[PDB]
């Protein structure tokens, strides 16, 4: 059963064990060593690390699990970086497709791919920002796809 | 060996004592006037023909295929002219009417002693 | 038909099968494959320059 | 990396070339045909890279094994 | 666990061996 | 023997015969191409089958297609 | 339980059967 | 060419095959007379029964255990190859008498080595 | 004919040693011989099937004979938990003294039998060695019967017609009714008459079964449909298996769940089970027409399934021709269905362990699983390989004019593009997540791991009633439709088996389920990428579309057109064997490291240390090879020295594979020439000259023998490790 992670026992056992275990090296230095300040910053980055995983679900393992159902209580877990990611490589993919359908109609398409025309490249890098309703409106013209390309025997 | 395998004795002439490379390996003496040369297999012999012919003139050359019964053969040339050059004596064997695109499917050839292209 | 015409192929063992290509030379001396067609892209032999017959000569407009 | 060399050593470009060309269908359908034509590797590259991964992975295994062995004690 | 049943078994697979070599030199 | 067949795509550019280091291939005058030539493979008893011809065959797809058939002494290329 | 039969059958199948089977198969290359 | 000298030929020429005329039972009996004395050796010191008093008998039984495989392969080699009946070593009958000579001379060499592990 | 290959003269002409290796490897390719026609093929395979089944029953009579004669079977029946079950005895003349004291289990020094055969013969109800002798004779008889049929149907008066083999119309009617329905119904005739009373104490041999009915009243007042009498008195709780005490007498009770004591399925459940499956298969046998003509013509059954939507070609017009007149399509479906059956069997021998005191011997349950899984993957790879043999040497695209298969070859670019897509998605998202968890765990932090709960399998376990999750759906919720719908019949006896944790039914689940099951789907979609690639580009690719002409397993196309290493349809088998061993590797590694965490008890050792790769290599391979690799010391040895010697052995096999896979021919083809010069030139041995000429192995053979040492080394290494590991942590 996925307990809420802020109250799970083995979670806070890992809190005591890692703050104490990393803290064992912190007594190897004086009060004004640069390493001692670095492990001050590291202990801060462990208490923040465990307070910022409060609303997750760590089960009996004491390790924060995830949920990928789109439950809308786990939306910040999976689906918000899911839609975020699909926007980012939809950006990248529409940039690359748009640049290849640029260099397909140029003088010499071979030299276009070694030496990227950074004018027209950085045109398409930035212009491919709104690929759902630009790739979709280039799909409604019947132009994202193709037909009767290369194939083997049958 | 020579008592059961077809030795290939390559006979040719030259003009000056040059030095070529054996297919067995290393440099050979290359008698200037006329010299025969026993070998082991045909690719060595025509590889030597490429070894000398692409460098310079070594024409009037052909291996007499010593088959172990005792006598010879003669292949390169037969009509006396170089093979990629065109002579009006050679009868072409080994063709079909079209590309591979009209060759028969091997389920039409299955359980028959035919080829996938004869039709 | 003519030189410079943009021609799709209909032979399945052409590497450029169902891809258009430009006509370079046509001989009218009953050669079985007279229509020399080269292409933008390149087969595995490194060579765009091939030739075809007349049944595999489908142009575009 | 050691285990990843074996993919290059055992197979050859007569597989990968029309595996790749079967992917080139999926680029020609979406007009993402790369203008430099995507061949597979050649044969000598497709075995030279199996050497250069077999040795990088194989040597870095004994590297990490050795330095993690003797640093942990000596 | 007994003795003669083992001999009965090796006789029956000797017969089975003759039927195996009887299948062998005909196919 | 390794059956060499030479189809009607053979436009007679003769990189095949120059590419064969065995002289199984010769050129035959054949009035069906622009050069008037079409290659022939009469002496396939010496044919190794190394497919060095098919590398240097600049037709559409392989006018000369080598089918790997019999394996004699000469067609296996063993020295001894 | 005849406790003596593997002392006969294990060697005569383990070593001498791949002697006469080498003779039958290997001469059966030429027969 | 080299390692083909007259000392090479004078050593090889009087070996128990290349010598001119010996009956094949004796021609193989010389081979077994050497090898049967030989193969007792690497079973006495290094064999598994070097710990009991069967140090010397295990060389006999193990070595003849090799010799039956050796003559068995001799009969396979003369059985498959050497088909003609020119009655010498290149025959069937002369090769199987060469093998029988190797067997009887080999077992005799085994008994000679066994009776010379006494002293 | 006259040479070595007494069947094809194209290889007898070759004076090299090719005639030996291709004479061996084409001995069974009956479709490509010299003069073996259509009738002469089927009349050969119909005899060799008899020879094969004779080898199966000689094998099972072998197991019956060694368990009957050298095992400790009835001594094991006396104490099933304590005594380790013996396999056949040993006669090594190589065991000096110290190994002879490492095997003494009784007077014999026999191997411990890690094959679960005493459990199956103990649920059958064999409680003797005598019944095993009568069974072993009873299968020497059957093996002699099948060999006599194999001689019989090759005698010329009895070699049947090809139309009899094309009576496909009636083989299904006879197999599904007879071979399945009658043999399964007779198998209830063994369970009801033997496995019910001999598990309830009553030793009922061949002498007294025609006098003592399994029910105290039976079959004269029982064509009346009063069938609750046969399922009236179930063996409820307080029973130890085999004994007569604490047991009822009902025949066909469907309890559901396990025994409480032996953790096995009830034999009343199995008797009712194969009885139901018997009736349904007999109903399936009455399917197609015959000489009587009441059923279904198969030509009408396929052609009528054409959609008016028009999307799915011109229907199945042609498929009935290209299953009868073809064979590798029929063999492809045969190995396909058998392969799914084997993987299913492995997915139920551990899950619902059928046999008494299994899940108690922790090695035979781990040997049967990995056994049927590697056999399962082998048989899928065979189904696809005869897929490619079907598309090359058996496919006619003119009887298949725009058929469903021609439609399959048409759009095959999309199929290979999408198997390559889903494979490329999983391989960046198991290796992405495992290298993430391994990096993150490596930096002193198991918490920053990506762990995703596999919610879907947990939800399906909630649909089968595993209440340890908190979903409360159809069977985990006691107030649903289905939970009430079988409230008396088989549910409450089964949710004890579900909600228990020690048993191996619906295992408890962490994110190792998630990450590994993505790695398994990675293995499947990669392996079918190879197989569907070299089974649909088997016929023609755009590198070379002549691939139909060169047969199946031609070597290459030479260096032309870029280079052509392994273009053939034999690369689908060749590469998908490595991916098959990889995938069944990951399956059985995963299963084995799951049940080593259950049986030891620390499932928290799994769930915390299996989502990163050093959890596997540390916590499983390094720790669990400790009783393996200590199999013999400079201090001495023990019983696992055979499995550690086999372990190192199989690393040597697995690495002699790489000499053939990596280092290809022409090295050795120009090195055997040096050896042949060295033997032709030496004195005293140039007399002994070869007949078959020494020639390095051609690269159809080279990649094969490297593949074979790869499999033999792989599978013998892992069968060494499963048995040495679980035999070392227990027993
Ligand atoms: C122009 C950019 C571009 C686009 C739009 C696509 C799109 C696609 N590829 Mg892909 N691909 C690309 C580049 C691209 N590819 C490159 C450079 C390679 C060589 C590494 C591949 C190798 C590849 C394989 C091997 C496969 C695909 C497949 C696919 C399809 C499924 C999506 C997927 O998983 O992608 C796969 C994505 C990758 C393998 C990694 C992304 C590749 C690079 C890193 C990003 C591309 C950005 C590009 C370089 C930007 C250049 C332009 C800019 C400078 C102006 C999809 C149509 C699959 C398919 O057929 O499915 C139907 C498939 O199996 N691709
Ligand atoms: C598969 C069956 C098989 C069998 C039954 C044996 C049996 C034996 N091996 Mg052996 N071996 C085998 C396979 C087999 N091997 C294989 C496959 C290999 C290669 C991996 C080897 C490699 C091997 C080595 C390297 C050695 C043995 C030795 C021995 C002997 C053990 C010494 C001992 O304590 O016994 C007590 C032994 C005896 C009382 C002597 C019996 C010797 C023979 C059998 C009797 C006499 C033979 C007779 C004169 C010839 C008649 C025909 C013959 C074929 C029977 C024993 C007879 C050792 C040996 O040489 O033994 C002396 C030894 O050093 N074996
Ligand atoms: C009713 C009559 C009948 C019966 C009983 C059989 C029986 C058989 N025929 Mg047959 N046949 C018949 C009529 C019949 N035939 C007719 C009328 C024709 C002509 C039209 C043919 C034509 C024919 C051909 C052409 C061939 C056969 C073959 C066979 C054999 C099948 C191979 C095998 O062992 O699979 C047995 C399979 C099973 C018992 C079941 C396997 C699948 C189940 C679902 C999985 C396992 C069950 C269970 C879970 C596991 C228990 C195992 C245990 C370890 C727990 C089998 C003996 C083949 C053969 O061997 O030739 C000699 C063959 O090639 N038959
Ligand atoms: C699927 C069909 C099938 C199969 C595989 C078996 C298999 C077996 N039965 Mg059997 N049996 C069957 C149907 C079957 N039975 C039917 C239908 C009946 C009712 C007539 C019986 C009645 C029966 C008896 C009475 C006995 C067996 C026994 C046996 C075992 C040994 C048989 C032998 O020595 O030969 C063997 C496991 C013997 C056994 O298990 O020993 C205790 C035994 O005594 N069977
Ligand atoms: C094909 C398998 C098979 C065979 C050959 C028999 C054969 C027989 N059964 Mg039977 N039986 C079977 C399956 C089988 N049974 C099954 C599956 C059940 C459970 C429903 C029964 C339940 C049953 C009862 C209850 C009785 C028989 C009886 C009998 C005998 C006389 C009728 C006869 C030997 C009668 C008898 O005399 O018992 C031996 C009897 O009273 N049987
Ligand atoms: C019921 C199962 C079944 C049946 C009947 C067949 C039947 C057939 N297969 Mg086959 N196949 C199967 C399963 C099956 N297969 C499976 C499961 C696979 C995947 C592994 C394959 C993969 C496969 C390939 C790749 C090919 C065939 C081919 C063939 C045909 C000829 C077979 C031949 O000549 O072999 C001859 C017999 C042998 C070579 C002996 C087998 C020895 C193998 C290679 C290694 C076993 C040695 C062993 C491991 C060493 C023991 C040592 C120990 C320590 C382990 C024949 C129709 C061939 C074909 O049709 O085209 C020519 C072909 O190329 N099959
Ligand atoms: C460690 C061994 C290993 C690995 C990782 C792979 C991985 C893969 N094989 Mg494979 N293979 C192997 C051994 C291996 N194989 C062996 C031994 C054989 C027998 C020769 C095969 C035979 C084989 C065939 C026949 C096929 C594959 C295919 C594939 C791909 C499946 C798609 C996928 O999951 O992509 C996910 C991608 C990965 C898992 C790549 C790893 C991630 C890398 C390391 C990250 C990128 C680089 C990284 C930033 C480091 C930079 C390096 C630095 C120098 C800068 C995948 C790349 C198939 C394919 O092409 O599918 C599309 C295919 O058809 N394999
Ligand atoms: C492709 C590989 C290949 C294959 C299949 C063969 C196959 C064959 N060779 Mg051959 N050979 C090969 C490569 C190959 N060779 C190479 C590379 C060379 C070097 C140039 C030779 C040199 C050669 C010679 C010189 C001869 C053969 C012969 C033969 C034939 C008989 C087998 C034999 O003599 O071995 C038997 C095995 C050995 C010789 C191995 C000896 C070492 C063993 C392990 C030590 C003995 C241990 C022990 C006593 C074994 C007993 C137990 C055992 C019998 C069960 C057989 C057809 C013979 C022939 O043609 O006769 C008709 C023959 O005279 N071969
Ligand atoms: C180191 C060296 C060497 C080597 C060595 C060797 C090689 C040795 C050998 C030796 C030997 C190896 C010897 C032998 C011996 C033998 C003898 C001396 C003989 C005798 C005889 C016999 C053996 C007989 C037999 C028999 C019998 C007994 C009975 C009857 C039969 C018979 C007759 C058979 C040398 C010198 C080279 C050089 C220097 C150094
Ligand atoms: C190449 C080729 C091939 C292939 C091979 C194979 C291998 C195949 C595949 C196949 C397979 C391998 C199979 C699989 C199957 C699938 C399935 C089978 C799925 C589905 C599922 C299901 C069915 C389930 C569900 C369920 C559940 C879960 C419970 C409830 C109810 C039900 C039952 C619904 C063939 C011969 C065809 C053709 C020719 C060529
Ligand atoms: C996988 C494999 C390939 C395929 C390898 C492919 C072709 C190369 C994949 C890596 C290249 C570098 C991808 C190209 C991507 C570019 C780097 C652009 C990406 C954008 C940034 C990363 C710069 C072979 O060509 C091959 C050849 C011979 C034997 C075995 C094999 C073989 O196993």
JSON list of C-alpha atoms and ligand atoms in Angstrom, two decimals, chain G residues 18-19 22 26, chain H residues 66 69 77 80-81, chain I residues 17 20-21 672 675-676 679 688-692 694-695 697, ligand 8:
[
{"chain": "G", "resi": 18, "resn": "UNK", "atom": "CA", "xyz": [31.95, -44.34, -30.38]},
{"chain": "G", "resi": 19, "resn": "UNK", "atom": "CA", "xyz": [34.54, -46.63, -31.91]},
{"chain": "G", "resi": 22, "resn": "UNK", "atom": "CA", "xyz": [32.90, -44.18, -36.04]},
{"chain": "G", "resi": 26, "resn": "UNK", "atom": "CA", "xyz": [32.80, -43.09, -41.25]},
{"chain": "H", "resi": 66, "resn": "UNK", "atom": "CA", "xyz": [45.61, -46.82, -27.00]},
{"chain": "H", "resi": 69, "resn": "UNK", "atom": "CA", "xyz": [42.43, -47.36, -31.17]},
{"chain": "H", "resi": 77, "resn": "UNK", "atom": "CA", "xyz": [42.44, -45.37, -43.11]},
{"chain": "H", "resi": 80, "resn": "UNK", "atom": "CA", "xyz": [38.48, -45.81, -46.78]},
{"chain": "H", "resi": 81, "resn": "UNK", "atom": "CA", "xyz": [41.54, -44.69, -48.72]},
{"chain": "I", "resi": 17, "resn": "UNK", "atom": "CA", "xyz": [34.75, -31.46, -46.10]},
{"chain": "I", "resi": 20, "resn": "UNK", "atom": "CA", "xyz": [30.16, -33.75, -44.48]},
{"chain": "I", "resi": 21, "resn": "UNK", "atom": "CA", "xyz": [28.79, -30.62, -42.82]},
{"chain": "I", "resi": 672, "resn": "UNK", "atom": "CA", "xyz": [44.01, -24.33, -43.31]},
{"chain": "I", "resi": 675, "resn": "UNK", "atom": "CA", "xyz": [48.27, -26.48, -42.25]},
{"chain": "I", "resi": 676, "resn": "UNK", "atom": "CA", "xyz": [47.76, -28.42, -45.47]},
{"chain": "I", "resi": 679, "resn": "UNK", "atom": "CA", "xyz": [51.18, -31.77, -43.70]},
{"chain": "I", "resi": 688, "resn": "UNK", "atom": "CA", "xyz": [48.83, -40.28, -44.43]},
{"chain": "I", "resi": 689, "resn": "UNK", "atom": "CA", "xyz": [46.99, -37.93, -46.76]},
{"chain": "I", "resi": 690, "resn": "UNK", "atom": "CA", "xyz": [43.39, -36.84, -46.42]},
{"chain": "I", "resi": 691, "resn": "UNK", "atom": "CA", "xyz": [40.55, -37.98, -48.64]},
{"chain": "I", "resi": 692, "resn": "UNK", "atom": "CA", "xyz": [38.07, -35.21, -47.92]},
{"chain": "I", "resi": 694, "resn": "UNK", "atom": "CA", "xyz": [40.49, -29.78, -45.38]},
{"chain": "I", "resi": 695, "resn": "UNK", "atom": "CA", "xyz": [38.40, -26.67, -45.88]},
{"chain": "I", "resi": 697, "resn": "UNK", "atom": "CA", "xyz": [33.71, -23.92, -42.48]},
{"chain": "J", "resi": 8, "resn": "LIG", "atom": "C1", "xyz": [36.40, -28.97, -41.66]},
{"chain": "J", "resi": 8, "resn": "LIG", "atom": "C2", "xyz": [37.08, -29.72, -40.80]},
{"chain": "J", "resi": 8, "resn": "LIG", "atom": "C3", "xyz": [37.50, -31.06, -41.04]},
{"chain": "J", "resi": 8, "resn": "LIG", "atom": "C4", "xyz": [36.74, -32.19, -41.16]},
{"chain": "J", "resi": 8, "resn": "LIG", "atom": "C5", "xyz": [35.30, -32.38, -41.06]},
{"chain": "J", "resi": 8, "resn": "LIG", "atom": "C6", "xyz": [37.68, -33.30, -41.42]},
{"chain": "J", "resi": 8, "resn": "LIG", "atom": "C7", "xyz": [37.27, -34.62, -41.59]},
{"chain": "J", "resi": 8, "resn": "LIG", "atom": "C8", "xyz": [38.10, -35.68, -41.85]},
{"chain": "J", "resi": 8, "resn": "LIG", "atom": "N1", "xyz": [39.46, -35.69, -41.96]},
{"chain": "J", "resi": 8, "resn": "LIG", "atom": "MG1", "xyz": [40.58, -33.95, -41.79]},
{"chain": "J", "resi": 8, "resn": "LIG", "atom": "N2", "xyz": [41.80, -32.28, -41.63]},
{"chain": "J", "resi": 8, "resn": "LIG", "atom": "C9", "xyz": [41.35, -31.03, -41.38]},
{"chain": "J", "resi": 8, "resn": "LIG", "atom": "C10", "xyz": [40.00, -30.63, -41.20]},
{"chain": "J", "resi": 8, "resn": "LIG", "atom": "C11", "xyz": [38.92, -31.45, -41.24]},
{"chain": "J", "resi": 8, "resn": "LIG", "atom": "N3", "xyz": [38.95, -32.84, -41.46]},
{"chain": "J", "resi": 8, "resn": "LIG", "atom": "C12", "xyz": [42.47, -30.12, -41.33]},
{"chain": "J", "resi": 8, "resn": "LIG", "atom": "C13", "xyz": [42.35, -28.71, -41.09]},
{"chain": "J", "resi": 8, "resn": "LIG", "atom": "C14", "xyz": [43.62, -30.86, -41.56]},
{"chain": "J", "resi": 8, "resn": "LIG", "atom": "C15", "xyz": [45.01, -30.39, -41.61]},
{"chain": "J", "resi": 8, "resn": "LIG", "atom": "C16", "xyz": [45.51, -30.15, -43.01]},
{"chain": "J", "resi": 8, "resn": "LIG", "atom": "C17", "xyz": [43.19, -32.23, -41.74]},
{"chain": "J", "resi": 8, "resn": "LIG", "atom": "C18", "xyz": [44.04, -33.30, -41.99]},
{"chain": "J", "resi": 8, "resn": "LIG", "atom": "C19", "xyz": [43.63, -34.60, -42.16]},
{"chain": "J", "resi": 8, "resn": "LIG", "atom": "C20", "xyz": [44.46, -35.78, -42.43]},
{"chain": "J", "resi": 8, "resn": "LIG", "atom": "C21", "xyz": [45.91, -35.75, -42.55]},
{"chain": "J", "resi": 8, "resn": "LIG", "atom": "C22", "xyz": [43.60, -36.84, -42.52]},
{"chain": "J", "resi": 8, "resn": "LIG", "atom": "C23", "xyz": [42.25, -36.29, -42.31]},
{"chain": "J", "resi": 8, "resn": "LIG", "atom": "C24", "xyz": [41.23, -37.29, -42.38]},
{"chain": "J", "resi": 8, "resn": "LIG", "atom": "C25", "xyz": [39.91, -36.98, -42.21]},
{"chain": "J", "resi": 8, "resn": "LIG", "atom": "C26", "xyz": [38.74, -37.95, -42.22]},
{"chain": "J", "resi": 8, "resn": "LIG", "atom": "C27", "xyz": [38.80, -38.85, -40.99]},
{"chain": "J", "resi": 8, "resn": "LIG", "atom": "C28", "xyz": [38.73, -38.16, -39.63]},
{"chain": "J", "resi": 8, "resn": "LIG", "atom": "C29", "xyz": [40.07, -38.15, -38.98]},
{"chain": "J", "resi": 8, "resn": "LIG", "atom": "O1", "xyz": [41.14, -38.58, -39.41]},
{"chain": "J", "resi": 8, "resn": "LIG", "atom": "O2", "xyz": [40.06, -37.57, -37.74]},
{"chain": "J", "resi": 8, "resn": "LIG", "atom": "C30", "xyz": [40.31, -38.45, -36.63]},
{"chain": "J", "resi": 8, "resn": "LIG", "atom": "C31", "xyz": [40.72, -37.61, -35.47]},
{"chain": "J", "resi": 8, "resn": "LIG", "atom": "C32", "xyz": [41.97, -37.17, -35.28]},
{"chain": "J", "resi": 8, "resn": "LIG", "atom": "C33", "xyz": [43.06, -37.48, -36.24]},
{"chain": "J", "resi": 8, "resn": "LIG", "atom": "C34", "xyz": [42.32, -36.34, -34.10]},
{"chain": "J", "resi": 8, "resn": "LIG", "atom": "C35", "xyz": [43.58, -36.83, -33.42]},
{"chain": "J", "resi": 8, "resn": "LIG", "atom": "C36", "xyz": [43.74, -36.21, -32.05]},
{"chain": "J", "resi": 8, "resn": "LIG", "atom": "C37", "xyz": [42.97, -37.01, -31.01]},
{"chain": "J", "resi": 8, "resn": "LIG", "atom": "C38", "xyz": [42.02, -36.11, -30.25]},
{"chain": "J", "resi": 8, "resn": "LIG", "atom": "C39", "xyz": [43.91, -37.71, -30.05]},
{"chain": "J", "resi": 8, "resn": "LIG", "atom": "C40", "xyz": [43.47, -39.14, -29.81]},
{"chain": "J", "resi": 8, "resn": "LIG", "atom": "C41", "xyz": [42.77, -39.34, -28.47]},
{"chain": "J", "resi": 8, "resn": "LIG", "atom": "C42", "xyz": [42.08, -40.69, -28.34]},
{"chain": "J", "resi": 8, "resn": "LIG", "atom": "C43", "xyz": [43.00, -41.84, -28.70]},
{"chain": "J", "resi": 8, "resn": "LIG", "atom": "C44", "xyz": [40.80, -40.76, -29.16]},
{"chain": "J", "resi": 8, "resn": "LIG", "atom": "C45", "xyz": [40.11, -42.10, -29.01]},
{"chain": "J", "resi": 8, "resn": "LIG", "atom": "C46", "xyz": [38.65, -41.99, -28.62]},
{"chain": "J", "resi": 8, "resn": "LIG", "atom": "C47", "xyz": [37.73, -41.67, -29.79]},
{"chain": "J", "resi": 8, "resn": "LIG", "atom": "C48", "xyz": [38.03, -42.53, -30.99]},
{"chain": "J", "resi": 8, "resn": "LIG", "atom": "C49", "xyz": [36.27, -41.85, -29.44]},
{"chain": "J", "resi": 8, "resn": "LIG", "atom": "C50", "xyz": [37.51, -37.07, -42.02]},
{"chain": "J", "resi": 8, "resn": "LIG", "atom": "C51", "xyz": [36.63, -37.18, -43.23]},
{"chain": "J", "resi": 8, "resn": "LIG", "atom": "C52", "xyz": [41.96, -38.58, -42.66]},
{"chain": "J", "resi": 8, "resn": "LIG", "atom": "C53", "xyz": [41.43, -39.21, -43.91]},
{"chain": "J", "resi": 8, "resn": "LIG", "atom": "O3", "xyz": [41.09, -38.65, -44.95]},
{"chain": "J", "resi": 8, "resn": "LIG", "atom": "O4", "xyz": [41.29, -40.55, -43.83]},
{"chain": "J", "resi": 8, "resn": "LIG", "atom": "C54", "xyz": [40.32, -41.15, -44.69]},
{"chain": "J", "resi": 8, "resn": "LIG", "atom": "C55", "xyz": [43.47, -38.25, -42.74]},
{"chain": "J", "resi": 8, "resn": "LIG", "atom": "O5", "xyz": [44.33, -39.09, -42.95]},
{"chain": "J", "resi": 8, "resn": "LIG", "atom": "N4", "xyz": [42.28, -34.98, -42.11]}
]
